[PDB]
């Protein structure tokens, strides 16, 4: 997989060049906001059950159709599958957050998922809406100001929103 450092190394090498001073500038920046990135990743790690349960409650609020008999998430063996899918996608979003690129998210998680769900018969729009609800229920835990130093982090919320959006657009 490629985080931002190895990504920049890749574009530097494929054009046969060293790393330009400007590239080192951006990447050292990334390094110094690394601690803010660590805080955001920890926020996603620790509030994972809360984010998942909130997204689940909302998702089965709008679409009760899933949990009725004959619905996808009905048989109580597919509910655990729904929750585990939510856990997996949240885990890969936090991975892409710490790394800095969607390489982890787009390689180990997303390339073969929409057709997996087509094969299983699972609706993909519902999975996309689950990921959007997870983005919602995860920003609020991500913006939490308690027990951590205070500073501007709008870059990290923008970036995490992009990762959730990319996962949803992949599955949808």
């Amino acid at each position: 997989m490629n985080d931002v450092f190895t990504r920049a190394i890749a574009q530097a090498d494929l054009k046969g060049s060293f790393l330009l001073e400007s590239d080192l500038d951006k990447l050292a920046s990334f390094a110094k906001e690394g601690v803010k990135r660590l805080d955001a990743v920890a926020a996603l790690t620790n509030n994972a059950p809360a984010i998942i349960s909130d997204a689940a409650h909302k998702l089965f609020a709008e679409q009760q159709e899933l949990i009725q008999p004959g619905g996808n998430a009905y048989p109580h063996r597919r509910m655990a599958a729904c929750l585990r899918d939510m856990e997996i996608i949240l885990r890969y979003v936090s991975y892409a957050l710490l790394a800095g690129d969607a390489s982890v998210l787009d390689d180990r998680c997303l390339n073969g998922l929409r057709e997996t769900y087509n094969a299983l018969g699972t609706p993909t729009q519902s999975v996309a809406r689950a990921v959007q609800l997870m983005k919602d229920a995860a920003m609020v835990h991500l913006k939490s100001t308690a027990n951590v130093t205070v500073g501007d982090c709008s870059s990290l919320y923008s970036e995490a929103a992009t990762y959730f959006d990319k996962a949803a657009a992949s599955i949808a």
Binding site: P75, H76, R77, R78, M79, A80, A81, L83, R84
Partner: peptide, 16 residues
């Protein structure tokens, strides 16, 4: 075992 007992603890854990 197919419907309720499979995926019982996980669902009763995530919905509390």
């Amino acid at each position: 075992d197919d419907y309720v007992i499979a995926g019982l603890r996980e669902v009763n854990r995530a919905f509390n």
